[PDB]
Amino acid sequence: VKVFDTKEVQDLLKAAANLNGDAGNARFRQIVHRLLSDLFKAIDDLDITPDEVWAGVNYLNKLGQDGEAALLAAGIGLEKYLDIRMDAADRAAGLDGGTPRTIEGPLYVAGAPVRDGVAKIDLDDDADAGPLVIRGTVTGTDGKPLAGALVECWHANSKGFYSHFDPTGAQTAFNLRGAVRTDANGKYEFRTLMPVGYGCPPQGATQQLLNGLGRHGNRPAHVHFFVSGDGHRKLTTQFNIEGDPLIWDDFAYATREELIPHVVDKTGGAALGMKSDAYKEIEFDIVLTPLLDGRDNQVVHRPRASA
Amino acid sequence: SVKVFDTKEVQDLLKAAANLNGDAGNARFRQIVHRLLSDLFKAIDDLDITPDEVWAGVNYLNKLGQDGEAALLAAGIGLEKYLDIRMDAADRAAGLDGGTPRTIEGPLYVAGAPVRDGVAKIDLDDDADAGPLVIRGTVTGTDGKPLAGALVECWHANSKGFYSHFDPTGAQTAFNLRGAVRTDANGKYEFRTLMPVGYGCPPQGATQQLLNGLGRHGNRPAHVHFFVSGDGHRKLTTQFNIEGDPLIWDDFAYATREELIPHVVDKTGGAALGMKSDAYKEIEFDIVLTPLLDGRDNQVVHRPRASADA
Ligand SMILES: [Ca+2]
Ligand SMILES: [Cl-]
Ligand SMILES: [Zn+2]
Ligand SMILES: [Zn+2]
């Protein structure tokens, strides 16, 4: 049977979204009506059974109980899709030359202390992670260095865990999370340890759905960035650690070819405060896009953790 | 607004996300996920849903599951009724629409109630504000013959609108206002209980938050839930509404049916029946069950349900 087009179903959808209601939140009602209508049509078209529907409802309970809705948003490509739509708007406006955006992911933590020029961000010992310097210059698309720009980063430890989200025990607040104001020449530097890739909580809702699809829930090793500066839009980006076997098989679809810098082996680490003389260096220069008529049309407000 | 949905990049992303080109797996699940994700992506593109709006929706899903309310929302936005609409249409096409009308289960069934022969008294806790109610009827097949030994289960709320096992103000006795009766040799069942009152969604919960955003209330008229089952017959999920409730045709869960509003009769003689006052109310609620088609019940629903020990 197919019932979606009947007046009873169409009236039910109008009532459920309160389309004929008194003045209210029209945009919200419009969105709810569209999503509900699409869901009802999919159920009808695919003959989705009550048992199947209630299994989906149960999944939503687990997803929220696990606090994983934003992790799922990354894992089924919704987060990348938002970037696709933002990139398409920038392309239509004729923008080029900026460092490409990529997904934020769900693990930013607000409030890290801001240092001038350089920050050492590994607060907790991690014997399995070697020392890493990340440094670069921030410019605008005209090539000029941006002084006093805010460069923020966050990344995982050798076990794939982030501070404020570590299920094995609390890390020091802001471990492997940093904020630096660029110097007069646009330079920033973080002294940290090398990340290893993230994986979804194995018993959580995201991995349960991925298992049902036959997909893994792993990311290659990477470092997240927010970069902002006077006169410029806020950039959300990342880089991947060169050579990681998952670099082009990220469960969150976030890799971009311009965001895979070279890793260089260096010496002299002790004089930089590193835990060994031998360390790795990544030079990651960043180009910000100017504001348009003084506005940033792509900055995203979403729930974010704090200290 | 940009329109990117129909691009190869987006269609490839959807195929990858649902693993359509992966190894042999759960094809049905991949098909459903791909359709729902595709529809979601298309809606975002068509309505220019912004990242801020999407992340507010994601945040809502976190709250919904934290509150344990996904099945309450399913009722409140009409999805639970929609499943009944589809089951009713299938029954009409199949000629299996001759029994008592179905309505929604709702999310508050609890397995494990003690079963009594013929008559059960189910008000285990006193409730000064609720008067005594007898519910009784006969269970027959569509051919009119009584069904002996059929299982009639019912559950309903107290005078504050709360159900046992789901009461936030304090623990009711296990199985308060929940019971099961095996019909007698002539198909008869009877419950002795107290009159339910309707109720609203948890006011701070995710379902009411969404309903508030839509400008809708989250209330149900007073009602009583039933499962009725028996050998050789399909399992009925139904309810009745208490006659005269002002919300009877303004139920947030869309569950009212005109065939399921029985007359309420005033009676006397309650004390002899173990009720707390001479005056009481009686509701007759007869049940007509449909025989199995081809030996299997193709409308019975499996979903997560609470359970408890008496
Ligand atoms: Ca530790
Ligand atoms: Cl932590
Ligand atoms: Zn990450
Ligand atoms: Zn109910």
| A155 close to A226: Cβ distance less than 8 angstroms | no
Considering only alpha carbons, which residue of chain B is nearest residue A38? B39
Distance set, CA B152 to CA B115, B184, B238 (Å): 9, 11, 11
Q: What is the DSSP letter of B235?
A: P
Alpha carbon B124 to chain centroid distance? 23
Q: What is the DSSP letter of B75?
A: H
Distance set, CA A191 to CA A118, A145, A253 (Å): 8, 21, 27
**B289 vs B170: CA distance, rounded Å:** 37
- Which residues of B are annotated as part of the binding site for Fe(3+)? 163, 199, 223, 225
What distance in angstroms lies between residue A10's CA and the mean position of ligand 4's atoms?
25
Ligand showing the shortest atom-to-Cα distance for residue A159: 1
Q: Which residues contact B133 (CB under 8 A, 6 or more apart)?
A: B192, B193, B194, B195, B280, B281, B282, B283
Q: How far is A103 from chain B, CA to nearest CA, in Å?
A: 11
Which residues of B fall within a CB distance of 8 Å from A75? 17
Largest Cα separation within chain A, whole Å, is: 76
Comparing CB atoms, the residue among A22, A35, A73 nearest residue B58 is A73
**B170 vs B287: CA distance, rounded Å:** 34
* Coil vs helix vs strand at B119: strand
Q: How far is B271 from chain A, CA to nearest CA, in Å?
A: 44
Q: What is the DSSP letter of B99?
A: S
Both tokens assigned to B124 = 């285990």
**A98 vs A288: CA distance, rounded Å:** 6
Which residues of B fall within a CB distance of 8 Å from A101? none
| CATH homologous superfamily, domain A1-307 | Aromatic compound dioxygenase (2.60.130.10)
| A213 close to B22: Cβ distance less than 8 angstroms | yes
What distance in angstroms lies between residue A172's CA and the mean position of ligand 1's atoms?
9
Contact (CB<8Å) B4/A212 = no
Interface probe with A: pick from B4, B20, B83, B85, most Cβ of A within 10 Å = B85
Both tokens assigned to B128 = 């000064």
Contact (CB<8Å) B4/A67 = no
**B176 vs B238: CA distance, rounded Å:** 20
Considering only alpha carbons, which residue of chain A is nearest residue B48? A85
Contact (CB<8Å) A64/B63 = yes
For helices A78-92 and B51-66, angle between their N-to-C axes, nearest 10 degrees:
170
Residue among B183, B264, B271 nearest B231 (CA): B183
**B200 vs B252: CA distance, rounded Å:** 9
Q: Which residues contact A76 (CB under 8 A, 6 or more apart)?
A: A209, B17, B18, B33, B37
For helices A78-92 and B8-17, angle between their N-to-C axes, nearest 10 degrees:
170
Residue among B101, B2, B99 nearest B49 (CA): B2
Residue among A281, A255, A227 nearest A98 (CA): A227
Comparing CB atoms, the residue among A24, A61, A85 nearest residue B214 is A24
Residue among B209, B301, B208 nearest B252 (CA): B208
| B82 close to B74: Cβ distance less than 8 angstroms | no
**A58 vs A112: CA distance, rounded Å:** 37
Q: How far is A295 from chain B, CA to nearest CA, in Å?
A: 16
Both tokens assigned to A125 = 């010992």
Ligand showing the shortest atom-to-Cα distance for residue A175: 2
Q: What CATH architecture does domain B1-310 belong to?
A: Sandwich (2.60)
Contact (CB<8Å) A53/B30 = no
Domain ranges within chain A, ordered by starting residue: 1-307
**B110 vs B172: CA distance, rounded Å:** 13
Q: How far is A38 from chain B, CA to nearest CA, in Å?
A: 7
Where are the extended beta strands (E) located within chain B?
A: 110-111, 115-117, 119-121, 132-141, 151-156, 178-182, 188-194, 199-200, 219-220, 223-229, 236-241, 264-267, 280-284, 287-289, 306-307
- Residue A139's Cβ-count burial label (10 Å; 0-12, 13-18, 19+) is buried
Ligand showing the shortest atom-to-Cα distance for residue A127: 1
| B306 close to B174: Cβ distance less than 8 angstroms | no
**A248 vs B79: CA distance, rounded Å:** 39
Contact (CB<8Å) A21/B77 = no
What distance in angstroms lies between residue A224's CA and the mean position of ligand 3's atoms?
6
> What single letter denotes the amino acid at residue A294?
G
Q: How far is A51 from chain B, CA to nearest CA, in Å?
A: 5
Q: How far is A131 from chain B, CA to nearest CA, in Å?
A: 35
Residue position matching structure tokens 């049905």: B28
* Expt. technique: X-ray
Which residues of A fall within a CB distance of 8 Å from B64? 60-61, 64
Segments in chain B forming alpha helices (H): 8-17, 27-47, 51-66, 70-76, 79-94, 206-214
Neighbours of A88 (CB within 10 A): 18
Q: What is the DSSP letter of B146?
A: B
Comparing CB atoms, the residue among B62, B86, B87 nearest residue A67 is B62
Contact (CB<8Å) B14/A45 = no
Both tokens assigned to A71 = 């992790």
Which residues of A fall within a CB distance of 8 Å from B17? 75-77, 253
Comparing CB atoms, the residue among B14, B22, B35 nearest residue A77 is B14
Segments in B176-281 forming alpha helices (H): 206-214
Q: Parallel, antiparallel, or unpaired for β B306-307 and B110-111?
A: parallel
**B176 vs B123: CA distance, rounded Å:** 6
Q: Parallel, antiparallel, or unpaired for β B132-141 and B280-284?
A: parallel
What distance in angstroms lies between residue A208's CA and the mean position of ligand 2's atoms?
23
Burial string for A196-221 (b: 16+ CB within 10 Å, else e) reads: bbbbbbeebbbbbbbeebebbbbbbb
Which residues of B fall within a CB distance of 8 Å from A60? 61, 64-65, 70
Residue position matching structure tokens 């014997």: A127
Can you give chain A as a three-state secondary structure string?
CCCCCCHHHHHHHHHHCCCCCCCCCHHHHHHHHHHHHHHHHHHHHCCCCHHHHHHHHHHHHHHHHCCCHHHHHHHCCHHHHHHHHHHHHHHHCCCCCCCCCCCCCCCCEECCCEEECEEECCCCCCCCCCEEEEEEEEEECCCCECCCCEEEEEECCCCCCCCCCCCCCCCCCCCCEEEEECCCCCEEEEEEECCCCCECCCCCHHHHHHHHHCCCCECCCEEEEEEECCCECCEEEEEECCCCCCCCCCCCCCCCHHHCCCEEEECCHHHHCCCCCCEEEEECCEEECECECCECCCCCCCCCEEC
